[PDB]
Amino acid sequence: AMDRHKPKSISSEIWALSETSKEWMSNLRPLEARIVECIKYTVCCHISDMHLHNGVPRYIVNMWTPPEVADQEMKRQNLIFARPNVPDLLDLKERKGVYVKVYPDNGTPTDYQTAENEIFVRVSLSGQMSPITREYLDEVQRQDVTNFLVTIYNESLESNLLERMQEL
């Protein structure tokens, strides 16, 4: 139904997959929230894309999977966490749970305390990365994530979309 509103920079399949999520639907600004949620997903895909550890994908992406499935994954890997929300990714190399946060943001996100087995990737819409994020992500990951963010940021400046997302 909202298809006319999909940014060019979001893939059709990610946009379609986002219909399985009630999160953006619960927001008072649902289109803006849906775009941000798709940005978050896309960032998870760039972090994980073709990155291997011991010959197989380094990461398990839990975002947009059922929490009971993510729990199966966490139990099978013995990577267990105690937040209400499950990590967005499991990093099987570092043995960490990864949470991704997107800041509609002129500015660089600030790092705040996490548990020892957690990493919080914190990125702005304008392509900025928190200090802990920049250190955690490798050069290829930083490039892939930032090039995507800058692409959608620059698309959003061509309409009222960036301003609207800043109104989240």
Numbering used by the authors: 0 to 167
From the study:
The three largest gene segments of the Thogotoviruses, THOV, DHOV and JOSV are homologous to those of IAV and code for the heterotrimeric polymerase. In this paper we present the atomic structures of the putative PB2 cap binding and 627 domains of THOV and the putative PA N-terminal endonuclease domains of THOV and DHOV. Despite very low sequence homologies, all domains have similar folds to those of the corresponding IAV polymerase domains. However, the critical active site residues in the putative cap binding and endonuclease domains are not conserved in THOV and DHOV and, contrary to the case of IAV polymerase, neither domain shows the expected in vitro biochemical activity.
To overcome this problem, we produced the homologous domain from DHOV PA (40% identity between full-length THOV and DHOV PA, 29% for the N-terminal part), which readily crystallized and the structure was solved by the Single wavelength Anomalous Dispersion (SAD) method using seleno-methionine labelled protein. The resultant model was then used to solve the THOV PA-Nter structure by molecular replacement. The three domains clearly have the same fold, and THOV and DHOV PA-Nter are very similar. For THOV and DHOV PA-Nter the putative active site is more like an extended groove and furthermore, is positively charged. Indeed of the cation binding residues, only an equivalent of influenza Asp108 (PD motif) is found in THOV and DHOV PA-Nter, respectively Asp-86 and Asp-87. The extra positive charge in the putative active sites of THOV and DHOV PA-Nter arises from the replacement of acidic residues and the introduction of extra lysines (Lys38, Lys61 and Lys97 for THOV and Lys39 and Lys100 for DHOV PA-Nter). Using the Thermofluor assay to measure apparent melting temperature (Tm), we found that in the absence of any divalent cations, the Tm of THOV and DHOV PA-Nter domains were respectively 41 and 53°C compared with 44°C for IAV. For the DHOV domain, which is already more stable, addition of these ions has little effect, giving no indication of cation binding. Finally, neither THOV nor DHOV PA-Nter show any nuclease activity against various RNAs under conditions where IAV PA-Nter does. Our structural and biochemical results therefore strongly suggest that THOV and DHOV PA-Nter domains neither bind divalent cations nor are active endonucleases.
